[PDB]
């Protein structure tokens, strides 16, 4: 069967929770074909302290010794520039993640984004320390006057001026618009990068999830298992995301936003938790998309080369040098991912067939 050497794969947007959920999902990073994971910090309470983020990573490394973990802080008024310099000097974080208040799980108390001024001391310190600023780029919803109303469909577009102003005010800060979902955002990222030759000049990039390469509004209208933030939008948005994924441009790379929830948190009649679980088959999901687009030769850049370059992942921090190999053996997504105890998760595209599987190969 056909095979594709993908090398050291990167998922630069991972949720792994705590407790028994973390013990279930953290080994699945490797199982899904991912060597390097960027760990998001929206725990309860958020990660805003150095000892917390040190312990968390060590807990993850214990659960999965072959996986390379890049950590983050949650953007909070609790952060100080001193805490940034210290954490960055100790290699305890690689970036800081911004959640606008109220917009997704564990996002209030995050921040309001027609502002960001109050966090300029933090960004300054991050810029100095070469830390990445990650953005859940959605403006909070507003329906009354005066302005044009903000809702789950235009909230990403409405965020794009904040993105531009941040890039303007901090031209040397690395910034990521996480999990892009709209055509408008894709074009904004390309227009920000119009003068870029060679990958190493990219200062603003965007990540793309597996599930937004498949879903539109119709897939989650009536199916909480497909409901996430930002919400999957219109077919034209989906087309633009897939084109960007297969484009070979260095400012689009893979981040799953795999966000696990126990099934009973998805089958609520009110307050469904947002989040789609894709960790267990992360790279096969993507392979499905690159195959259907006749773009397999661009797979390696999207799930490996470009994320490593943007984050400057050194071989010396890599926990395992095994390479992820895709091999074209068909498989069936299970109905549930379970720990055999109190946790069942519905995986993305549960029940469906995937053309590809992943295995691991020693280097040299």
Rounded to whole angstroms, the Cα distance separating 145 from 213 reads 34
Q: Which does 250 bind (CB under 5 to 8 A by kind): Zn ion, a copy of itself, none?
A: none
Q: Is 91 known to sit in a ligand binding site?
A: no
Q: Is 85 known to sit in a ligand binding site?
A: no
Work out the widest C-alpha separation in the chain, in whole angstroms. Answer: 63
Rounded to whole angstroms, the Cα distance separating 211 from 27 reads 20
Q: Are 53 and 71 in contact (CB under 8 A)?
A: yes
**Chain-centroid distance, C-alpha 291:** 22
Binding mask 198-217 for a copy of itself (x = CB under 8 A): ------------------xx
Residue closer to a copy of itself by CB (options 12, 103) is 103
Residue closer to Zn ion by CB (options 257, 305) is 257
Position with the least CB separation from Zn ion? 136
Residue closer to Zn ion by CB (options 30, 136) is 136
| Helices 50-63 and 19-31, packing angle to 10 deg | 60
The reply on whether position 231 binds a copy of itself by CB under 8 A is: yes
Q: Is 179 known to sit in a ligand binding site?
A: yes
Q: Which does 257 bind (CB under 5 to 8 A by kind): a copy of itself, Zn ion, none?
A: Zn ion
Write out the E strands in 180-254: 204-208, 252-254
Q: Which does 138 bind (CB under 5 to 8 A by kind): a copy of itself, Zn ion, none?
A: none
Give me the sign of the Cα torsion angle 272, 151, 138, 184. positive
Q: Are 106 and 43 in contact (CB under 8 A)?
A: yes
Residue closer to Zn ion by CB (options 4, 206) is 206
Whole-number minimum distance, CB 181 to a copy of itself, in Å? 13
The reply on whether position 274 binds a copy of itself by CB under 8 A is: yes
Q: Which does 136 bind (CB under 5 to 8 A by kind): a copy of itself, Zn ion, none?
A: Zn ion
Q: Which does 110 bind (CB under 5 to 8 A by kind): Zn ion, a copy of itself, none?
A: none
Write out the E strands in 174-228: 174-177, 204-208
The reply on whether position 147 binds a copy of itself by CB under 8 A is: no
Whole-number minimum distance, CB 91 to a copy of itself, in Å? 37
Stretch that binds a copy of itself, among 47-55, 86-94, 190-198, 228-236 (CB under 8 A): 228-236
Tokens (6 digits) for 341? 């105890």
Binding mask 64-103 for a copy of itself (x = CB under 8 A): ----------------------------------------
b/e per residue 229-264 (b: at least 16 CB within 10 A) = bbbbbeeebbebbbebbbbebbbbbbbbbbbbbbbe
Residue closer to a copy of itself by CB (options 142, 325) is 142
Which strands, in side-by-side order, build the sheet including 72-74? Answer: 72-74, 95-98, 132-135, 174-177, 204-208, 252-254
Rounded to whole angstroms, the Cα distance separating 9 from 37 reads 9
DSSP state of 325: E
Known binding positions for Zn(2+) = 13, 15, 97, 136, 179, 257
Residues that bind a copy of itself (CB under 8 A): 141, 143, 149, 151-153, 216-218, 221-227, 231, 234-236, 263, 266-274, 346
């Amino acid at each position: 069967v056909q095979e594709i050497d993908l090398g050291l794969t990167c998922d630069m947007h991972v949720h792994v929770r705590e407790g028994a959920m973390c013990e279930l999902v953290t080994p699945k990073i490797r199982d899904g074909g991912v060597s390097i994971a960027y760990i998001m910090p929206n725990l309860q309470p958020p990660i805003t302290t150095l000892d917390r983020v040190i312990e968390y990573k060590k807990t993850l490394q214990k659960l999965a010794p072959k996986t390379t973990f890049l950590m983050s802080f949650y953007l909070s008024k609790d952060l100080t520039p001193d805490l940034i310099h210290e954490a960055a000097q100790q290699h305890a974080i690689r970036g800081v993640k911004c959640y606008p208040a109220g917009v997704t799980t564990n996002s209030a108390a995050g921040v309001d984004p027609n502002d960001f001024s109050a966090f300029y001391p933090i960004f300054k310190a991050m810029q100095e320390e070469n830390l990445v600023l990650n953005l859940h780029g959605e403006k909070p919803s507003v329906h009354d006057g005066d302005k044009e109303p903000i809702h789950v469909l235009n909230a990403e577009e409405a965020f794009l001026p904040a993105l531009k102003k941040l890039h303007n005010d901090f031209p040397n800060l690395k910034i990521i618009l996480e999990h892009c979902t709209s055509e408008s955002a894709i074009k904004t990222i390309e227009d920000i990068n119009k003068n870029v030759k060679k990958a190493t000049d990219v200062k603003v990039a965007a990540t793309l999830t597996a599930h937004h390469l498949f879903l539109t509004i119709d897939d989650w209208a009536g199916n909480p298992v497909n409901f996430c933030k930002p919400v999957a939008k219109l077919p034209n948005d989906k087309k633009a995301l897939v084109k960007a994924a297969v484009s070979g441009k260095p400012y689009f790379f893979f981040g799953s936003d795999s966000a696990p929830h126990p099934v009973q948190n998805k089958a609520n009649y009110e307050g469904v938790c947002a989040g789609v679980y894709s960790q267990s088959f992360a790279i096969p999901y993507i392979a499905q998309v690159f195959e259907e687009q006749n773009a397999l030769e661009n797979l390696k850049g999207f799930v490996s080369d470009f994320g490593i370059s943007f984050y400057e992942v050194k071989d010396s921090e890599v926990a395992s040098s095994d390479k992820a190999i895709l091999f074209k053996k068909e498989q069936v997504i299970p109905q549930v991912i379970s720990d055999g105890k109190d946790i069942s998760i519905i995986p993305f595209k549960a029940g469906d067939k995937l053309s590809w599987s992943v295995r691991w190969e020693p280097r040299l």
